[PDB]
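User: My advisor, Dr. K., asked me to get a structural model of this assembly before our group meeting. I'm new to this, so sorry if the format is off. These are the inputs:
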Amino acid sequence: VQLQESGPGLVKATGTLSLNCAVSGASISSSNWWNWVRQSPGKGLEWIGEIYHSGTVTYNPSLKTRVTISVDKSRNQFSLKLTSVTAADTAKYYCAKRWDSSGWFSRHSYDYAVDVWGRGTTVIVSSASTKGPSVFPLAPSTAALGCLVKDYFPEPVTVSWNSGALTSGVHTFPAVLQSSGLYSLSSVVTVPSSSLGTQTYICNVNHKPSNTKVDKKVEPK
Amino acid sequence: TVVTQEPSLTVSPGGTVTLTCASSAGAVTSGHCPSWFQQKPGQVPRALIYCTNNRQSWTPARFSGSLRGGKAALTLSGVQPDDEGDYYCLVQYSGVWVFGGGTKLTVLSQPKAAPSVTLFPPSSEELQANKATLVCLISDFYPGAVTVAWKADSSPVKAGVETTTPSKQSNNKYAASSYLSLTPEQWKSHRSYSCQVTHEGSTVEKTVAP
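Assistant: The format is fine. Below is the predicted structure of the whole assembly, which you can bring to the meeting.
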C-alpha cells in the first residue's frame, strides 16, 4: 500500500489548488479513510479532512467552506480541491490512509490513526511570476555589515562578497517567505573595524531564475 | 478545541523524556484515540503510537504511550541521537482530527549557547525608495528554539513581522532572522525600535533609532 500525490506546485493567489493521490496496493473501495494533511514550511501539521469510499467526508472546521475531498474509483484515486487560495496555503501537502475497523456490517470506528503517508508534494501560492530582488546595503555602525535582498521570487538567490574574494566571516541567512508570497534574505560579513576606512565591501547578488545580477557597495554610513 | 504540547524539550543520550498532550475541551480519554507522530528533519511524519498505547510494527521499544492526569503522554527511554526531531500528538473529536502544535526534541550534543543578535535599521537607500525594513539577525544559538518579539518604542508590534524558523549552521548551532516592514513615516514616528529574542527563558534585546 503506497500513496503518491501529484498536482501543480505553483498556484496563483485566489485560484484553486487541486491535488490527486494515487493509491496502489489497495482498492479505494476498501475499509480505509483517505486523508489529507498539510504543513507550512517550518510550522506544524494541520489536518485537512478525510473521506470514505461511500462519500462520507469530514473537514477541518477552519477550512470547511474552501475544501472539497472526492474519491475516483475509476482511477483508484482520491482528490483535494482548495478554493480562494492565498499565500497562507503554501505548504507541503500529504495524503495518508487510516484503517476503519468495523466488526459490524456498517460501523465507523476511530480505533486506528493514519499509519501510511505519501512522500508529500510542495505547493507554493504566489501571484508573482518571476521577480528580481531589490538590494540594499546594511551599513556598519570588529564590525558587521551586510546586504538585504528583498522581495524576489522564485527561491534560488546566491550572494558573494567582493566577487568571492572575501571567503571568511560571511554568513548568508536562509530566506523568509513573506505573507506577500515573495522571499527576502540577508547576508552579513564580519570584518575588522580598522579596515572600514580603506577596504571596499561589495555584495554581489545573483537571482538565477531572472538572471538578475546586482553589485552593491556597502560603505560605513 | 486546541491541543497543547510543550514547545521544545532537551535530553541527553541515554536519558528519558516524557512529552504530554492536553486538550482545551477537558480530559483526554481513550475514546479520543490520542496518537503520536515523529517527524525527523526533512522527513514525512511517522506514526509511532496510536490509540493511547498501541505501537506500530516499526516503532522502537524505547517509545511508550499512556494517559496521565487527563493528558496523553509519550515517554522515550534510553534516548538515542537519531531520535531528535519534532513530535506531534493527534486526537479526534466526534470525527474531526486535531494535531497539537508539536514539540521540538533536542538530544543534547554540545553546550547550550545564547544567540548573538544584530539589528540593522532601514538603510538610507531604502528610505529614499520610500520603503523601510528592520532586519534582526540571530545566530549561534543552541538548542535551535527561539522566540522573537518586536517593540515600536515600548509597544509590542504584530503587523509587518515575518520570521524564519531556525536553520542549522555549519557549526551545528542555529540561525534565524526576523524582518519588520514599515513605512518611512512610521519609522520616523518613533524614537526607537527593538528586536527581542528569547532563548531558554532569557531575552536578548537590540535597539536602533532614526
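One thing worth pointing out at the meeting: Chain B has two domains: 1-109, 110-209.

User: Perfect, thanks a lot.
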